[PDB]
Paper text:
Hantaan virus is a dangerous human pathogen whose segmented negative-stranded RNA genome is replicated and transcribed by a virally-encoded multi-functional polymerase. It catalyzes two fundamental steps of the viral cycle: replication that results in the duplication of the viral genome, and transcription that generates viral messenger RNA (mRNA). The interior of the core adopts a right-hand organization that is common to all RNA-dependent RNA polymerases (RdRp) and comprises a palm, a finger, and a thumb domains. The active site cavity is located in the core center at the intersection of four tunnels: the RNA template entry, the nucleotide entry, the template exit, and the product exit tunnels.
Numbering used by the authors: 226 to 391, 401 to 432, 449 to 695, 700 to 885, 893 to 926, 931 to 1492, 1497 to 1609
The structure:
Amino acid sequence: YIPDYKGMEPIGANIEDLVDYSKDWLSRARNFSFFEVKGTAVFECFNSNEANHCQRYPMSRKPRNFLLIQCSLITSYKPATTLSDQIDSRRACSYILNLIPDTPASYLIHDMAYRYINLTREDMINYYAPRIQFKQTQNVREPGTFKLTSSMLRAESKAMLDLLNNQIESLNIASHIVQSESVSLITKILSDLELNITTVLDKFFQNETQKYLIDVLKKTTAWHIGHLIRDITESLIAHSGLKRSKYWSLHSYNNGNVILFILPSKSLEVAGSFIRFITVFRIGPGLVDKDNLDTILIDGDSQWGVSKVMSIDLNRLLALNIAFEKALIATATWFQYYTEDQGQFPLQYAIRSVFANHFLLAICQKMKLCAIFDNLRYLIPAVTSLYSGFPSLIEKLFERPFKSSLEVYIYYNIKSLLVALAQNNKARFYSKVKLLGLTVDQSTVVYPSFMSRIVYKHYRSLISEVTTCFFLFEKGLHGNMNEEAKIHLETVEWALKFREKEEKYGESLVENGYMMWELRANAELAEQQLYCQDAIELAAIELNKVLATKSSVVANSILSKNWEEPYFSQTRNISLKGMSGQVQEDGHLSSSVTIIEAIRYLSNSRHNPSLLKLYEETREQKAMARIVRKYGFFITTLPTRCRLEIIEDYYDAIAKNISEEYISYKILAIQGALEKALRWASGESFIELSNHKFIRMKRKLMYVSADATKWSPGDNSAKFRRFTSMLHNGLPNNKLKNCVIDALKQVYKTDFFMSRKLRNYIDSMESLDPHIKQFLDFFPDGHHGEVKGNWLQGNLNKCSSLFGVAMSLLFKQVWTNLFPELDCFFEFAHHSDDALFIYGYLEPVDDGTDWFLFVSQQIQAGHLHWFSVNTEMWKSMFNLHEHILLLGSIKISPKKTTVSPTNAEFLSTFFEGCAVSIPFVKILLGSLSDLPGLGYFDDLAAAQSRCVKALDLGASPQVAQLAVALCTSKVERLYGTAPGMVNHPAAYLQVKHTDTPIPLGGNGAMSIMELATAGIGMSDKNLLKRALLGYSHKRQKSMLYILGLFKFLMKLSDETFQHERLGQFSFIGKVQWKIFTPKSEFEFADMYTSKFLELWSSQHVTYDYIIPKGRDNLLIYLVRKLNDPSIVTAMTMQSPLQLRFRMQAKQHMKVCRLDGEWVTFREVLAAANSFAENYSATSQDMDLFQTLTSCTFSKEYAWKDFLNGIHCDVIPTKQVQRAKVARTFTVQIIQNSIPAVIGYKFAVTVEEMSDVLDTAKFPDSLSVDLKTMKDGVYRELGLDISLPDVMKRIAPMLYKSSKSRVVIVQGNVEGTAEAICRYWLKSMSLVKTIRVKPHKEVLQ
């Protein structure tokens, strides 16, 4: 049922009125919004912005410190050990005690060295003892620390400690001297870093990546400095515990040449805490900035740099810990991009320079560099086009102050590069190429590298280089304290502008729109946040001209949106996305989760309402918005999400029916527009004269790339109302359309709330600036203020895209009506937030006298709008298009919008951006970023899955293999399972490290190909199959021992309760690891006990395959989902408390579950060996093992078989780069889904039966389907489905789910998973051509 909502009565909007308005508008001069790229213009823009930056900022004469850790290396670095730490610390203290301190930091260092070197033998024994054998001493109260009180502290040291415990200038970027000094310093550091200290995939890796990348960088100073930095950051992390951070610590490295002093500090477990440390090193080549050192002590022919006190937080510490891996993966990505651009491997000097640059960027994590590279990502396209908004981007380069030498150096390089690129465009000339399927005239002009003296053939290599640089910075830098405040002020500024417009014109005009006659009378109404009602209606008519031919499809799509389906039974409504909660007693808006709000509603309700019913029950509630705590993003409340879902469902249903013409979802619309444009340009124009003669006019094209659909804080949602009122749908009534209009009306006004963090920051300002004064004045009660028009980045993308398409069609009709005699062209295409506009204009073939005479005569004959057509007609085309878009509330961005002629590189970049949305380097670096902390097996699986996802995003298999190796090495380091460390399974399990199951610390190192095809768990499956075969054939003892290990893991799993689900069924046992959740701090996690939840899960088995629809079962199901360890870990990902477990993992504490106790991983291994030694196989165990080996894991072994049965050979042909395209990695009797059939099988209750009936598409066939499949299991494999255990084992074998992976490939590849695998095998070499031998389908 749909309640009767009020509709909108149509207005008498006339297209000819808009045509007359455009006639008047085009009769005068208009300003083009973009600037010509000239080289001199870019240089002058840089100089003027330098002068302005000098004006706005107070001057600093001393560049700030940018190196968090200062050190030097002259010899190959050996990783630190406890014995090496002791020896190096003794030698280092002996070295330091001979020196004469000058500065207070030097005095503190001397005092610390004296205290450490005078600790007793028991103190030294307990200083390096593990937590198990540690015994507290008077001086040593924590394992790796000691005590240093004021009795032995000097006066200078004590004063310095007291000072430690208890306006924004900028460098003079306009000075050539400041640039010269910064360039000199950074050049010296980079040269120091570059110095040298003194399977088929396996073969390709050893010949290419090992030879040209790994062997080159293995000897560089950067490699060993990175390992030394990893050791230092490990010490700093180990000191960050609650008990240990209050004491002092001393560590040493490189035979005493590097010394770390750790001072008492607040623990990193609690948020907003810093570790303080001082690094003392021998002066030499490395990460040395002598001008920023605290002091330089002199010894006989030697120097010791003592740094100032460094305070580092948890995120910066983790980034510095993984800096070496980040730099190596960035350099490997650069390696692959270089081989793609040039077709050859880079030389040693270029790889060394790239690696040094990447390492310097990765160790120096600051927001200024990240913002600079973010801006460069769009600055590079802005100087390679004909027209762009590069002055605005160069201005954006100067928003924050310049503080360090590194910032000045990067800016100087960027200015040089951009001026060089802009000066390249002056050699533009017309030529001939083969675009799409035509020979067309293109206007082309050597792109220098940014870190080496390499020149690319394409500027997309430059763009990807800058992108990889930008992703070297942690995503935790965004947000911080400047971005949150900035987004708050931007929102409040746009709301204040909306209020000013309301005061000037009245609330009705800003909400309902202005009329065309008012626009003619005032001419200032054409702006952002205001729209013309006539323009909205006419754009709706223009879109209706396309929609009226597909009315049936649009209607069927809308009714296919399932408006009567229960709201909270859908996945998107029970997710962990993030949602605003309730207004608390103190008056703030709560940051909450979608599932938590779902449980809050159901617990206070008696039914699971549908979307329309939920909208009617919450209609009267006000929309509320907030900034997300830490994850510039907004979160809204449940009624706001419901209204946005109504609007977006309606408009997605409508917009999917024009996806092949205007809105690319794939690239068909853009290719069609390009084909039409190129076909049009092939012809010639003949303008008819009054004297029956003709003028010959030549056709040319201009392309504009713009982000027109992207959400803007300056916008008015109310326009959509009239749009919705006039858009044609096939429905016979207006109830659904009226409901959409009503939802739009209810989303108009929002309560935007300040955050607690920002409020505290404001209260700590101590000096309220005028903009801060206005921002605080925006909130009457100090908590929330009303916002209108702006929908706060809510999901309305399909509506905005459809609206933009309608306005572009309106412009197309208006321009056709303006020049009936002229034969002009216009074609546009939308893809996500991007849009490509193609204008086809006319130029005189001759000198142009006849054309000028014709234009003058047309002007004299009263057609005054021909003034805009005399020269540069495409400019007037774009001006009128932009003005018409502004008649809605669409402003084409002055920045980030590029204008080009026909150009192969421009179109290639646009199509590449359309095909791929995420660079694979982002996923590659996020693999090292952080781990879920759920144990060895889970962390390994997560890292491997991220590497496979990166491979799906276009990463070469060699780069992905290197990333897999690095991630596996890091996980083994964290859990101690690698050889030589205390958690190595080979010391307890009496089997080989490769014969050990992964949950028991086994060797998880696997090929990237098998991980991508077979999956992220096939090591255990292969081990089980081999052990079963060996025992069943030869009855060997070792195979029985491996089976016993698997049975021990299975018993471990049975000890715990993991109901799981069809999509996450597990059969190989897993060690249960300690997860220090906030003890279920979640609000509604305490509704039902774990025992009650386990009983419910056992009783209701059908709900393990489908989702309940009734309120009670849904509430219990959602509580159970809340109580999932994996969901708990994800819901506390950004909590600063997690590191405790990491430390407990590194200290090898009692973090594993065994016999209802918390024990060490070593104790788990000992129990595993004890169980496996006495284990004897039974009939039930052998039967089960056969079901898993031959049936459950059957699909994965098949991909392995195909992998092992393939043959590839090198063809004497150079590799050819191709356009990248997305494909689907997807690998009949039963007409219902397997989850529905199985739930029907297990349905015993009326509620469960009804739930499966609603879930199933064809309920009537359900039983029949079950029957036939119940035959197959008892016919193809001879197993009894009637047993629930057998059903659970066989269900994931019969479930052909997932495969919804999207893989980026080249053009030739097909959509078959076998084709994707064959393409991956052909891309196993970065230079050579690989041909597969079978040349047929060899996958079962």
